[PDB]
Design a protein around this nucleic acid. Sequence first.
RNA 1: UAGUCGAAUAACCUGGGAAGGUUAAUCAAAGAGGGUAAUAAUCCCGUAGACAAAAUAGCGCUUAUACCUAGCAGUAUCCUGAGUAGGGCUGGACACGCGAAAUCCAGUUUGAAUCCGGGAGGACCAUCUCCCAACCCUAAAUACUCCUUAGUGACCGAUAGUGAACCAGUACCGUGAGGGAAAGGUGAAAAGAACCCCGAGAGGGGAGUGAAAUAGCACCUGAAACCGUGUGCCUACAAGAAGUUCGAGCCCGUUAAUGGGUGAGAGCGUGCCUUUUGUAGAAUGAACCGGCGAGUUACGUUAUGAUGCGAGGUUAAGUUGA
RNA 2: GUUCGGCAGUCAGACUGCGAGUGCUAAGAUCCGUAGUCGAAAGGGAAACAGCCCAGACCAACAGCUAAGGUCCCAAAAUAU
RNA 3: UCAAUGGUAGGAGAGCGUUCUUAACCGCAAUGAAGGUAUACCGUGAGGAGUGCUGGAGCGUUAAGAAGUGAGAAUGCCGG
Lengths: 117, 146, 206, 64
Amino acid sequence: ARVKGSVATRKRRKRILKLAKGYYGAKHRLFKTAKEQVMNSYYYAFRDRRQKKRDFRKLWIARINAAARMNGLSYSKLMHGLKLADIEVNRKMLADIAIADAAAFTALAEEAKKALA
Amino acid sequence: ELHSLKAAEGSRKVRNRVGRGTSSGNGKTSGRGQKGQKSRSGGGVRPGFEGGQTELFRRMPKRGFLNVNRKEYAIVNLETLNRLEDGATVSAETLVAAKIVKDVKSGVKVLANGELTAKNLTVKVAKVSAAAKAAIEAAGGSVEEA
Amino acid sequence: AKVSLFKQDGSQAGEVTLNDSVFGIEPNESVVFDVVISQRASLRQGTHAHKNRSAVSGGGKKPWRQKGTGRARQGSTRSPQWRGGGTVFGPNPRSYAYKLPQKVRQLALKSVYSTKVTDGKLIAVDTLDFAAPKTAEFAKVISALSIERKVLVVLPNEGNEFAELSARNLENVKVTTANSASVLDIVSADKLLVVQSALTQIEEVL
Amino acid sequence: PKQKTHRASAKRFKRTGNGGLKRFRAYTSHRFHGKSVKQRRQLRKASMVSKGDFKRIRRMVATM
RNA sequence: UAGUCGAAUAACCUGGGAAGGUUAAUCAAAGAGGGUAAUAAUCCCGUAGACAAAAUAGCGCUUAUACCUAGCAGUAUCCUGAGUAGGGCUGGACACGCGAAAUCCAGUUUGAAUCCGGGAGGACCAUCUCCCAACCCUAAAUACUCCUUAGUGACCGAUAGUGAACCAGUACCGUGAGGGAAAGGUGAAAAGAACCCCGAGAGGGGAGUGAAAUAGCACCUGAAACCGUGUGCCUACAAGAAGUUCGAGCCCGUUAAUGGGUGAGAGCGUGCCUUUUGUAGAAUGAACCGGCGAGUUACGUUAUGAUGCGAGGUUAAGUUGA
RNA sequence: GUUCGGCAGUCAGACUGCGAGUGCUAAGAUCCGUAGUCGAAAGGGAAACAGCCCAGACCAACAGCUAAGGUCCCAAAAUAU
RNA sequence: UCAAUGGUAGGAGAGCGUUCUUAACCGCAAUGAAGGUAUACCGUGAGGAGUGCUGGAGCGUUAAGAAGUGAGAAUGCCGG
């Protein structure tokens, strides 16, 4: 019963290497540095499944205080006027109005002006 | 069922393939933790061991010598007499032809415990307890001991 | 009950003096596959060997000494990790036999027995003990109902001899008696002919 | 082959059916001066074996 | 110990080739197994059965012979196993470690009785039970195979399986005792590449060979590390466990898929193992790649379940049998 | 929670306070009790940080709200009152 | 619906894959088995098949049994 399963073992080897392909140079020409190299990459892809959340929101709030600051408005009193404001506490679609919305942007800003007012 | 041999419960379960893999592990450890007399090969440890101190049993006094002429009678209940009625001349032939116990210590004995369902007198014994002699001998028995 | 009593298969459609004693039960298939595993390896020869580094060898001497000279603490090439491979714990010359107690054995015969009772793929057959041993005889008597896949053949216990010194080239014929009983006997074929002495060929211990 | 019963351990111990073992008393053999009058009154007899200890029974005192 | 006979089939499709698929038929003590260019019951070896040996080594049966024994009552006395039992000391074995030590056998010493006898009955003294040493032989049931075949495999497939499938105990090391390697596969069939050309030659290239020439003599199959040659994108203001995530831009079109190959740029990101209190480590260790390479079983106990029957469960060894 | 039965390993830890001891009331020093922390628990904060503070992660997600801590730029929120 | 799902040594449960299994069940195979190779599928995982190509003989199923049985890592070994 001295049996091997050799091609099965190399199929685990082949399976992880074909799933490991792409990174720098020697790595797919070797075995084991590639093993972390997918692995570390979706460790912090697991973090960036939370951190492109927490950085695209920085793009969101940052560009919306960029246009608010273009109206001379600061993000904290704007959002403060958003809690003062209507049923809208809508956040990041309200970040998405950075394209071409003087009506939506500056008028909802005026809604916030009559919310602080 | 030779087309589709199936097994039932309990008789089978996986024999634990201990010492491979990542999940149960146990080849890295075998439940053990390294760097100790426990942590090695052989399984070499004597069971009774007070840490080099003498053991519990090693502190025991030497009590009671033993009679080489120790001999008993393979004592039965009277509850088997509740089984067999009457079996006149209750003896070893009734006992081992009743197949109660076959390899016997030579005689036979009944308890006072067990009930007086039997009617016969001539119970052939080597030695029945006098507590049971109260029972059967007050319950239509005769003593035939040896 | 009533299954066969065939003097030849197709030639006398009658009863079966089974007898309809205790045979009709729950067939305990737990007990059945117990007898297929214990009755299995009753012919495993098991003569696969096993060896050891101290069994077959050339070297019982350390091939260098370690200090400074390159490599590690090390036994030998005869130590198994080289091409001189010693098996670790491996096989052994082991046996594999066990037989069950009597009441679960006869209980096991009277499980698949019952399955063949209500199944009726057993057929009560008379002697049909022929002149020649040729298997055109039993080719057309066995194929005179032609149970197709594979069949067990209940002889008497006087030892029929003409399908029995022959019909080993008849590829589905299993020569058997009352001294043939197992589960690898019957669960193997599932389809069988009977000699109608099956009372004193079955009941006598069962 | 078999598992060898330690016969002298059997000469140490005596266990009961459906119950524990009888353990004779310590101290009771060698001097009796410094052991008390009450300890002489009471230490002829002795109590049973432990509960959480003595589980090293297995199986050094087998089937005696 | 030489071997002998020994049944039962044809076509079509495929392919380089049928036994494969398809169509049909036979046999039967032979549908074990192995070959056959590709898996056969009917092609062959065979197989099952049935015959055959003078010499050959035997086994066994019948025959008179190949020779020494019996019962039996009584008891004239003799015999019956002398340095022998024993005893001392020193040993040892016997479960027995000198111990209450049996009992036996040694050295050494002393030394009986002898049939009204003598011995054993775990110191020993009486009663009882048994036996007759100190003379010799004894098959059978048992142990193991270098060997001879008949063989069998939930043996094993070329690091395995014998060190050794191969001219293996070979090469080789060592003066020696010793040690001790490596390696099988073309193609069915060498049908082994005529010729022609390059080339000092080899080697190549055409031709032709073969089903196939990436099939060409270490030749089935051919990864893997290594070296390449081509290829779309990007990089010569850059100081990263070499990554993600987003993504300008480019290129291409897929187990038809919210496509892939990129990737500038930009955010955030201390390899893996044992040990430790804590290692990213300047703590170990790992050149890489592939192969091998490690928790068993023998018997026993306990626990837990499963099944069976139940104060009744249970056959061990063995015998039978494949 | 007890009892009974198997099956374990752990013996040598630190650190932060808090209260002790020893020590130059030296120490990332020892040695106690006491809680936490790590070990064996990521993420955030403090420039990186095992031990401090907050907050215990099944996973997706282009959701929001919030803990401490921050809001002149890196680097997001207050040139806030 | 509610509650739970950090987790090492620890302990429990379950499943995958390899090989042999006469078993059967029941097929594939030269129109191409196995094996290799690319592959932009699926499966919580291990893992599974589809196609293209090499390649020219055994392999797969199912279910169950039995195991020299699941490979990095040791101055691991051998070979390159």
